Design an enzyme around this catalytic site. Sequence first.
Site, PDB file in Angstrom:
ATOM      1  N   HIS A   1     -12.255  -4.685  42.245  1.00  0.00           N
ATOM      2  CA  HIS A   1     -11.904  -5.559  41.182  1.00  0.00           C
ATOM      3  C   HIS A   1     -11.090  -6.384  41.388  1.00  0.00           C
ATOM      4  O   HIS A   1      -9.946  -6.579  42.528  1.00  0.00           O
ATOM      5  CB  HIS A   1     -11.038  -4.381  39.893  1.00  0.00           C
ATOM      6  CG  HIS A   1     -10.786  -5.167  38.532  1.00  0.00           C
ATOM      7  ND1 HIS A   1     -10.251  -6.090  38.342  1.00  0.00           N
ATOM      8  CD2 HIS A   1     -11.738  -4.721  37.863  1.00  0.00           C
ATOM      9  CE1 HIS A   1     -10.844  -6.152  37.514  1.00  0.00           C
ATOM     10  NE2 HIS A   1     -12.190  -5.290  36.559  1.00  0.00           N
TER      11      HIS A   1
ATOM     12  N   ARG B   1     -24.436  -2.520  53.008  1.00  0.00           N
ATOM     13  CA  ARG B   1     -23.675  -3.136  52.513  1.00  0.00           C
ATOM     14  C   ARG B   1     -24.401  -4.708  51.321  1.00  0.00           C
ATOM     15  O   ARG B   1     -26.204  -5.172  52.241  1.00  0.00           O
ATOM     16  CB  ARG B   1     -22.735  -4.760  52.494  1.00  0.00           C
ATOM     17  CG  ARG B   1     -22.373  -5.643  51.959  1.00  0.00           C
ATOM     18  CD  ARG B   1     -21.413  -6.670  52.573  1.00  0.00           C
ATOM     19  NE  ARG B   1     -20.901  -7.637  51.897  1.00  0.00           N
ATOM     20  CZ  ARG B   1     -19.628  -8.322  52.455  1.00  0.00           C
ATOM     21  NH1 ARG B   1     -19.321  -7.386  53.019  1.00  0.00           N
ATOM     22  NH2 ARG B   1     -19.399  -9.709  51.115  1.00  0.00           N
ATOM     23  N   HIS B   2     -24.935  -4.036  50.194  1.00  0.00           N
ATOM     24  CA  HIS B   2     -26.291  -4.971  49.305  1.00  0.00           C
ATOM     25  C   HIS B   2     -26.583  -6.713  49.984  1.00  0.00           C
ATOM     26  O   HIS B   2     -25.341  -7.018  50.681  1.00  0.00           O
ATOM     27  CB  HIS B   2     -26.249  -4.826  47.772  1.00  0.00           C
ATOM     28  CG  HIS B   2     -25.057  -5.682  46.951  1.00  0.00           C
ATOM     29  ND1 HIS B   2     -24.741  -6.882  47.057  1.00  0.00           N
ATOM     30  CD2 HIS B   2     -23.817  -4.630  47.052  1.00  0.00           C
ATOM     31  CE1 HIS B   2     -23.835  -7.306  46.364  1.00  0.00           C
ATOM     32  NE2 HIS B   2     -22.692  -5.900  46.266  1.00  0.00           N
ATOM     33  N   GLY B   3     -28.002  -7.194  49.389  1.00  0.00           N
ATOM     34  CA  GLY B   3     -27.644  -8.598  49.745  1.00  0.00           C
ATOM     35  C   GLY B   3     -27.274  -9.150  48.637  1.00  0.00           C
ATOM     36  O   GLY B   3     -27.022  -9.125  47.160  1.00  0.00           O
TER      37      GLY B   3
ATOM     38  N   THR C   1     -17.052 -11.631  41.866  1.00  0.00           N
ATOM     39  CA  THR C   1     -17.575 -11.106  40.921  1.00  0.00           C
ATOM     40  C   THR C   1     -17.166  -9.185  40.430  1.00  0.00           C
ATOM     41  O   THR C   1     -16.771  -9.450  38.829  1.00  0.00           O
ATOM     42  CB  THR C   1     -19.206 -10.820  41.814  1.00  0.00           C
ATOM     43  OG1 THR C   1     -19.929 -11.794  41.615  1.00  0.00           O
ATOM     44  CG2 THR C   1     -19.581  -9.653  40.898  1.00  0.00           C
TER      45      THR C   1
ATOM     46  N   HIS D   1     -20.506  -1.905  48.975  1.00  0.00           N
ATOM     47  CA  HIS D   1     -19.746  -3.444  48.695  1.00  0.00           C
ATOM     48  C   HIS D   1     -18.959  -3.757  49.775  1.00  0.00           C
ATOM     49  O   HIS D   1     -18.088  -2.585  50.320  1.00  0.00           O
ATOM     50  CB  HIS D   1     -19.534  -3.739  47.432  1.00  0.00           C
ATOM     51  CG  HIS D   1     -19.676  -3.370  46.232  1.00  0.00           C
ATOM     52  ND1 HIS D   1     -21.067  -3.863  45.811  1.00  0.00           N
ATOM     53  CD2 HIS D   1     -20.365  -2.192  45.659  1.00  0.00           C
ATOM     54  CE1 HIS D   1     -22.133  -3.791  44.515  1.00  0.00           C
ATOM     55  NE2 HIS D   1     -21.288  -2.149  44.420  1.00  0.00           N
TER      56      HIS D   1
ATOM     57  N   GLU E   1     -17.558  -2.261  44.309  1.00  0.00           N
ATOM     58  CA  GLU E   1     -16.455  -3.482  44.792  1.00  0.00           C
ATOM     59  C   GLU E   1     -14.794  -3.555  44.603  1.00  0.00           C
ATOM     60  O   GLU E   1     -14.793  -2.396  43.641  1.00  0.00           O
ATOM     61  CB  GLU E   1     -16.941  -5.106  44.255  1.00  0.00           C
ATOM     62  CG  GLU E   1     -17.001  -6.039  44.726  1.00  0.00           C
ATOM     63  CD  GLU E   1     -16.500  -6.510  46.491  1.00  0.00           C
ATOM     64  OE1 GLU E   1     -15.436  -5.567  47.289  1.00  0.00           O
ATOM     65  OE2 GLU E   1     -17.356  -7.075  46.784  1.00  0.00           O
TER      66      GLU E   1
ATOM     67  N   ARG F   1     -26.597  -4.436  41.966  1.00  0.00           N
ATOM     68  CA  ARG F   1     -26.635  -4.685  42.574  1.00  0.00           C
ATOM     69  C   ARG F   1     -26.307  -3.517  43.939  1.00  0.00           C
ATOM     70  O   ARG F   1     -27.618  -3.731  44.968  1.00  0.00           O
ATOM     71  CB  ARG F   1     -25.717  -6.239  43.078  1.00  0.00           C
ATOM     72  CG  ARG F   1     -24.453  -5.659  43.182  1.00  0.00           C
ATOM     73  CD  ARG F   1     -23.289  -6.641  43.342  1.00  0.00           C
ATOM     74  NE  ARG F   1     -22.246  -7.110  42.865  1.00  0.00           N
ATOM     75  CZ  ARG F   1     -21.225  -6.208  42.154  1.00  0.00           C
ATOM     76  NH1 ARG F   1     -21.229  -6.779  40.921  1.00  0.00           N
ATOM     77  NH2 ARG F   1     -20.228  -7.197  42.758  1.00  0.00           N
TER      78      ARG F   1
ATOM     79  N   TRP G   1     -24.371 -14.110  41.232  1.00  0.00           N
ATOM     80  CA  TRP G   1     -22.812 -14.447  40.960  1.00  0.00           C
ATOM     81  C   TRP G   1     -22.666 -15.090  43.028  1.00  0.00           C
ATOM     82  O   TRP G   1     -22.064 -16.177  42.865  1.00  0.00           O
ATOM     83  CB  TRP G   1     -21.856 -13.707  40.748  1.00  0.00           C
ATOM     84  CG  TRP G   1     -21.988 -13.192  39.393  1.00  0.00           C
ATOM     85  CD1 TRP G   1     -22.858 -14.499  38.552  1.00  0.00           C
ATOM     86  CD2 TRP G   1     -21.123 -13.423  38.323  1.00  0.00           C
ATOM     87  NE1 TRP G   1     -23.092 -13.830  37.125  1.00  0.00           N
ATOM     88  CE2 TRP G   1     -21.633 -14.006  36.748  1.00  0.00           C
ATOM     89  CE3 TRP G   1     -19.467 -13.067  38.333  1.00  0.00           C
ATOM     90  CZ2 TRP G   1     -20.609 -13.809  35.417  1.00  0.00           C
ATOM     91  CZ3 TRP G   1     -19.005 -12.660  37.322  1.00  0.00           C
ATOM     92  CH2 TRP G   1     -19.602 -13.358  35.925  1.00  0.00           C
TER      93      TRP G   1
END
Lengths: 237, 243, 231, 237
Positions: A90, A9-11, A22, A181, A88, A61, A15
């Site tokens: 919506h 999962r990205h850092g 987001t 995400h 991610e 991201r 936002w």
Amino acid sequence: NTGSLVLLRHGESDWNALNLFTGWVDVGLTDKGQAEAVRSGELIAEHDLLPDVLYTSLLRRAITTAHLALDSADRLWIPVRRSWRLNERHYGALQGLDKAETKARYGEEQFMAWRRSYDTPPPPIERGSQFSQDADPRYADIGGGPLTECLADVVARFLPYFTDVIVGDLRVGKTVLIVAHGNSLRALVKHLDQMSDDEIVGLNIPTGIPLRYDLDSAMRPLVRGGTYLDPEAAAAG
Amino acid sequence: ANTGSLVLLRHGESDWNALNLFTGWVDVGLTDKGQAEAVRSGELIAEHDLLPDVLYTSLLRRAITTAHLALDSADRLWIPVRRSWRLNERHYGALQGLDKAETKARYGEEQFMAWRRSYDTPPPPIERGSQFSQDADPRYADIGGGPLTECLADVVARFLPYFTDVIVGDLRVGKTVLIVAHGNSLRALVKHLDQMSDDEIVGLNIPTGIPLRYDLDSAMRPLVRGGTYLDPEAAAAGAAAVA
Amino acid sequence: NTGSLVLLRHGESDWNALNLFTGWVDVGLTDKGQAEAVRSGELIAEHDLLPDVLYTSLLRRAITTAHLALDSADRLWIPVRRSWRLNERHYGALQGLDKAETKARYGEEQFMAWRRSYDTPPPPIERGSQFSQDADPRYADIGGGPLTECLADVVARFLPYFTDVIVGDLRVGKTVLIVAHGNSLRALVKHLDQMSDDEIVGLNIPTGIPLRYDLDSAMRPLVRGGTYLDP
Amino acid sequence: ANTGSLVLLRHGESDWNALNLFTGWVDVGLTDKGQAEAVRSGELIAEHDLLPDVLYTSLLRRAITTAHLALDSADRLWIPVRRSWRLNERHYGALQGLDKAETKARYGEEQFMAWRRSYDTPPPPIERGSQFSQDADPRYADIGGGPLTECLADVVARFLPYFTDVIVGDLRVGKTVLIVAHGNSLRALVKHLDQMSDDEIVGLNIPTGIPLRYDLDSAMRPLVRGGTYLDPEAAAA
């Protein structure tokens, strides 16, 4: 061997730093988010989990996180595939709104529901509004995409990609890296560990710590919930 | 579909360009300045509304990161990408890892220029297993670890099958294709597009950082011989700047 | 411009000849079914509609239909991709049964609902039974597959393939041939023509006659319900 | 059991084989005899527990139809397939559409033999746009219409890229690969696998309709040189 499956999962995004909902809005990583991704790559390499193929969402991201991670892992050359199905959730009309301000305006109960209802999505975003993605060409083949989603919708649109594309890679022994995400990975963990609707709602997945799944012949986890490569770092809660 | 636009992009300065070392297949990174070049390449592609539909790269991080940075500034990070060894830089044989000046001193002018540019004579073969050899890298396992050295003729032979069988079909259905690669491999492609002689391409220099657009017909013949640089001025000066 | 979409429902199978519910049972074409496929190819060629790519289900009656059609259209060499998402509806425990036995087993009320409902599937087939597919390796990546399906389920698993794979080809101008089954093509027509849940279940699709859909940039039919290529 | 098995199959009798015509890239079909060969090959494959995971063919119908009938019999019709001109039969240039007599008539006996078994000397180039030329066929557009003639050296040269960059990768991850093709393209492949000399491969016979099995090591090296036919007794006939 069934291949190892590594989820990431990205850092921190811009936002995240502004405390905004987001969703599909395509924001970038902060400096800290970029630094986390680099370390992600070190962890992968440090645990002898060099991927053979990379799957990402269409959101920068995650894509940049994947790039930075592979760079640190010295595996930039491997094949990559991208899909909106890894995006991610919506966030509908919440996209672009401040979370704190939203909690205040609608309260904790509506807030928590919006953020954590499995079956009930936020209100639909207005087509062609400032923070809608419905006019983006990357979504033309799906008619511009949904106007809002709940986790149950993510589950439904993520799973076909996983079964039809990624499982095939695992089955032939490839190590697979997925960079995506909170909600799309929560959807995958719900499927892998066969979790219930209310059990999945309490699940938190920490940012930037790779999560390793060891699967059997049936794509069943050997270890339920998988194994984080830095459990204490994972352990922040 | 009418034939897609073909966009060619040479990466900028690497850490080994900066140290004056022969690189070839050695997988060196970009300098801060080569990274900045790549970001600028992306801007140009966007300002000229040449938004790619698909990306092709080599397996070398200096091209791959150039691509990522350009697509990010052009806001096309989400497009599909394919990579192939056939887009790699020329392998420099036993010259990989050696300083160009030091090598020039010892071997002479004529030998030095023959190695860098002779169309059909490659540099001497690298030692299997040696420090700057790729022969044991898994990424080249399916080709037996690859060649131990290459001339431009060699690059042309191994590059074109990928162009005809993979990239052309993209162009045929009208996709804007971005190839981010290297001096010799892009020169190999240009030789083929413009049907250049062996003699002519040895003189051709492709500048770093400046996208080159080819407008092709249905038979993949250029409508503008030599293509069109998005920054023709910069192009002329980058063509000079070289090395 | 956007490519043409050509749809083709295969002809008679061995089990159609005995009036047996088939679903995912992988039965073959009758010789009549084969000859119908050959003619399908002739019609496509006769209308100058040569496909650039072929999509089929994993079921031999469609796969063979496509082979024979493309042979007769002299476009055998084109790329082909196959997907379970193009399969016929799974008929659950009715698979292998005739009506009689089915009304016998399940009563007339359910026979009717299972025939004309959009959202009511038949009973699940028993796992490992004689006409179940759950053990077939071709379905391993989906855990053996569903043990029954209603039309709604078919729509849900068909459309992801259509949007994520086939629409892309159409968008870059390719002529696309889809050779599949009654309910998977019904699902697609539901989407293309935006038909209601109530109206779709009795929509008729004849076998062996190609159906041409001209679409705009928006992937919308220029002609509602398409155009059948036939005399 | 990690490196996958390779199964090679040469189609049987074509309609031009029956007329004793030089065929090359001319896209003729299978005789009744030819189809039956195909069907039996599929039974042989199944009888030896060799279920293919993926199929590779040329762009020529005699091969594609052979593959279809074989997979039908082996009940593996559903597997993925990929086709490439690089698996095509040798292009026979000006000889395409000629019999031996009309060939010896306009070209002479001296090179008829030459073009028969010379590794390195192709027949004359065929007339572009002529009746048995494929130069204008849209399936060869991406390669400029294709070559106007080939020798076996040529075939080796355009085959191998496809082997190394596409097929080997499947083998590497353990898939059983079925290649259905033609005399000179399979010859190209066996010359590579068993490291046959230019002069060795000229007298190599591959029988029609008998699957040829190659078991391979991680180096893509055969475990058994020459491989194993599935109907040994019939090796030449």
